[PDB]
Point group: C3
Chain length 113, copies 3
């Protein structure tokens, strides 16, 4: 049975301005392992990754009905799909992410069998 | 058991032009109760409230697989619960209705899933 | 019991360029029946149909955990019923498939949920 559902949309411009102002933004939004991936990328690619991780965590927060990013983590499997490797929920989590050159979107569904 | 699913995306500029046109748009899309909330807001937040209610209603109609016109907007209503989240207070369905809405300074999006246990 | 979930967004301009290439884009992406519907439309409405079928096929591939470039375009088919709702008439899956599509002047998006 379903126990929650949430979505989010975000402009890349908002993430770009946030990086400059408080140059510690990333350290507070990403975990250690996520951070390693961030620094290895460059250009638009680097910004698109940070933006997608922020949108995914926000969708999950809305799905649980609450308003701690450090106890949430999103990685990529060998085929390339994104999945939650760490979260305060013991059921199953179904996630998906997509983008364009101007913004990103994400969708989450929570289930308990 | 899932019994339906629908989504919608809309440009804010399109909703703003319709209101400025002075054609009775808001009165056609919103109920009396929804209208009371609309008039208490100001600026961009006022336009985003109308846009969100329009997007959610169109999304529900696709989940039913009928589209909206065979059924007007006055047959549906969306308010905010005691936790502050949007929900359907009126609709022709007896099961559980899962709804979510989001926006930026240029677009608004909505998603609906129907279920019965 | 849910078994998969996926979403996708596509730029109209990108589909247009692919077509302008003349390569033979539409022929590799659409089935015989989808193509017959495509040729009966014109103008913007024509470019919107092709873009929507591409977005839908990619959302299903991601819901299964892969990509459309690997699964193959000719193995999936999307039609419209007598009320206008879109649905999958052919696919390599045994359960139920729930789909929805929406568009603006510049973009198109789609969402899929798999159930067994
Ligand atoms: N009765 C119905 N139920 C569910 N979806 C419908 C419907 N009639 C039309 N649609 C869908 O809504 C889409 C129109 O998008 P929108 O009005 O949100 O911009 C159509 O795109 P297609 O004709 O390309 O399949 C179609 O998929
Ligand atoms: N095999 C796969 N199955 C499902 N999703 C996949 C996938 N391979 C890549 N993706 C996703 O597609 C996203 C890119 O979306 P787009 O379709 O607009 O190009 C990737 O973003 P990330 O690499 O940041 O995780 C990733 O989440």
């Amino acid at each position: 049975m379903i126990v929650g559902h949430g979505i989010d949309i975000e402009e890349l411009a908002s993430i770009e301005s946030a990086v400059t102002r408080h140059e510690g933004f990333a350290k507070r939004v990403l975990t250690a392992l996520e951070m390693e991936r961030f620094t290895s990328l460059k250009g638009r690619r680097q910004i698109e990754y940070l933006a997608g991780r922020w949108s995914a965590k926000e969708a999950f927060s809305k799905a649980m009905g609450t308003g701690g990013f450090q106890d949430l983590e999103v990685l990529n499997n060998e085929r390339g799909a994104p999945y939650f490797s760490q979260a305060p929920f013991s059921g199953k989590i179904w996630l998906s992410i997509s983008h364009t050159d101007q913004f990103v979107t994400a969708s989450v569904i929570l289930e308990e069998n």
